[model samples]
Target: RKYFVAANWKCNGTLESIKSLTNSFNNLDFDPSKLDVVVFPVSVHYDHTRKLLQSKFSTGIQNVSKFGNGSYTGEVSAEIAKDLNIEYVIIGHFERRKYFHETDEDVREKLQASLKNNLKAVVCFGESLEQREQNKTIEVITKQVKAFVDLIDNFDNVILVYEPLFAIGTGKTATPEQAQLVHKEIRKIVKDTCGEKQANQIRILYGGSVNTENCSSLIQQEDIDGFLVGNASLKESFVDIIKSAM
Candidate 1:
């Protein structure tokens, strides 16, 4: 499978910084065929960033409204994102779940919206530190994965991101072994739910405090196809992370 490295610049970045970052990214040296890269800038910067990045790289939205185009106040719908040429939408991110109270059903609705508009869905799910300590990691992730799989008819335009809540932006990262174990279980869950063909073809990514230092090791894991980078994605280190995946 081709490695996928996505940057979720959650609620961060300025116009000046976006310009500088995109300039640096456009000059990156890597083969597009070996790896797939996408940047999730704040919606405000989406158009500008899209204009700056090289064609080899793509742009995605951090979230999309479950509701379609209409009078939804501040909500950005999948139709609008697709209209703006956005290629991907993140669904069920930990922050969205925690801050916005986006339940699994909410995530499912958003996923349906994204897929309906032909935007690829990068679905995020994982357990918290407490759940991990209680040995409920697999249990938590299974339910999350099942929620999406139940609605998805195929693996096309779908990517699963496993981001343990305990590690995101906490300067902590799951060990490569720990990440691989969860990734393996995620794949098994997909296989059981979808079928063997979909399971092997689907790409599963590891997220949470993924940085240049640990990216090399994480990418080495068989089940870890790539990452859904958080803080580290804000700096030049993101380029190194992508290179490591290559």
Candidate 2:
């Protein structure tokens, strides 16, 4: 599988910072055939960032509304993203699940909208600290993965990101061994539920506290196809993380 490195800018970045970050990214040199690179900026900065980025690098929205072109105000729909030429959308992020109270059903609805609009989805799922302590990590992740998998008829336009809630933005990261175990389990779950073909074709990314320092070891894991970077994505080091995957 070709490695996929994605930058989840979250709600960070100012106009000046975005310009510098995009300039740094535009200067990077790599073979696109071997690496799939995408960046997710806030909805307001989507067009600005995209125009600054080279064609090889794709741009995505951090979230999308479940409805399509409706009365919902301040909500960006998948159809709107497609109409704007956005190539990807991130769904079920831990922050969205925790802060916005997004449910499995909600994630499914948004993912269905993205797929229907012909946009690829970066589906995020993982367990919380409490779930991990109770050894229910697999249980929680399985439920989340199944929720989205059931809605997908094909896996070609989907990417799975396993980002444990406990690790996100806490400056904590799952060790290579720990992350690989979960990723391996995720692949098995896909194979069992979807099929061997879809399972093999799918790319599972590891997120949370990912940086240039830990990226090398993390990328070495067999099941770790790439990463869904957080804080590091806002800095120039994001390019290094992308290079590590390559």
Candidate 3:
């Protein structure tokens, strides 16, 4: 299988930061079409990022409005994202759910909007640190994947990103074995709902404190097909990480 890579720049870069990163990325001959490289930058950088990244990789937004468009000033409408040919939009990121008060139902609505706008969605499913300590990781993540999927079971344009809440940006990556376990479970749920064929085809990526140092081994796991890197995606190390997957 051809593995892919997606990075969540997550309020971590300025325009100059992006310009430097893009220069490094552009110099490397990445096969975006074959490998499905993508990144989710903050909303303000979406347009510029997409323009700069068009040839080397696909650009995505970090969030989207549940309603296509209304009076939501701070939200980016899914319609506008689609108009920009945004290939993916992330929903229910662990941080967003934990700090920003996003609910399962809210994410379902976001998925609906993405589908209606004909944009691909990266639906995040994960457990919190306390939840994991209490042995609720799989259960919590399962419910997350199940809820939004129930809302759009017949749709196949969604990607599943599993990011342990405590691991993100904490340099606390799940071991390859651990990530593969969840990957299997998540793919099993998709198989039961959408069938094995499509379930096997849909990408399931591990997202956490991923950097080039520890990334290749994670992707080398049997069930982990890609990544939703947090901090490293915005750095030149991203180039090495992408090559590591290949």
Candidate 4:
């Protein structure tokens, strides 16, 4: 299985930052022999970021609309992403759920759109701090996982991202053991939902306040397929995280 490291730039980036990051990507020095690398910039810079990267690796959009091309305004659809040569789309992020009231059903719709357009869906799922403290981590993640399992007929090219809401941007990451617990459960959920063959074929990633210092320990875990990096992704050490995964 190939390790996957994805950079989720979120709603951050100025022209200068983009230029610097693009330059960093161009000059990135690493053994690119055993990993899948992807960069997802803000939607406004999607095309520009793609152009800047010059196709050295895959590029993605932070979000996409579940609706097709219709009366929807300000919504970027899967069709448009593919048309622009975007290779992946992140759906079901915690911020979208908290700020935009995106539900599991909506995430399923977006996943459907991604699959229909032949775009790889980086499907996000995880429990809140409250849910985790209440010992409902697996239960909460399972429900989100079921939304995908119930909606999609094929899990061929899908990527599952386990992003604990409590740890995101908080700097207090889940210990490697903590992340491994959930990732293992995630794989089990996939195995039950689609059978072992398909579950083993799936890649599950960890996303939170991931940084270079903690990256190597986290990726050393067996169940952690790779990282869906947040703040560290905007730095030069993001390459360190990728190398750690290798």
- RMSD of each candidate? 1.3, 1.2, 1.9, 1.6
lDDT tens per residue, model 3, 93-177: 8778878999999999999888888888888878877788899887887788778786554434788888877665565657878
Residue pairs whose backbone atoms clash in candidate 2: none
What overall lDDT goes with each candidate model? 0.88, 0.89, 0.81, 0.85
Ranking by TM-score: 2, 1, 4, 3
The sequence of per-residue lDDT tens digits that candidate 1 reaches over residues 133-224 is 89999999999988878777667579999988876656666788988999999999999988988889889999767888889999999999
TM match of model 1 to true structure: 0.96
Off by over 4 Å in 2: 169-173
On a 0 to 100 scale, what is the lDDT of residue 141 in model 3? Answer: 79
Clashing pairs in 3: none
Candidate 4 per-residue lDDT over residues 1-246, each given as its tens digit: 678899999889998889998888777655545568899999888767878885556889889999988899999999988888788999998889989999999999999998999898889988888888898999999999998775555564788899988776665568889999889999999888888887887888888668889888888888888889888889877877877876
Q: Estimate each model's TM-score.
A: 0.96, 0.97, 0.93, 0.94
Please give the TM-score that candidate 4 achieves against the real structure.
Answer: 0.94
Worst ten-residue run, lDDT, model 1?
A: 165-174
Off by over 4 Å in 3: 152-156, 169-173
Winning candidate number (lDDT): 2
Give the alpha carbon lDDT tens digit for every residue of 1-246 in model 2. 878999999899888899999999988998877789999999888878988899889789999999999899989988888888899999998889888999999999999999999999999999988788899999999998888797777676899999888766566656889999999999999999989988998999997668888999999999999999988898987888888877
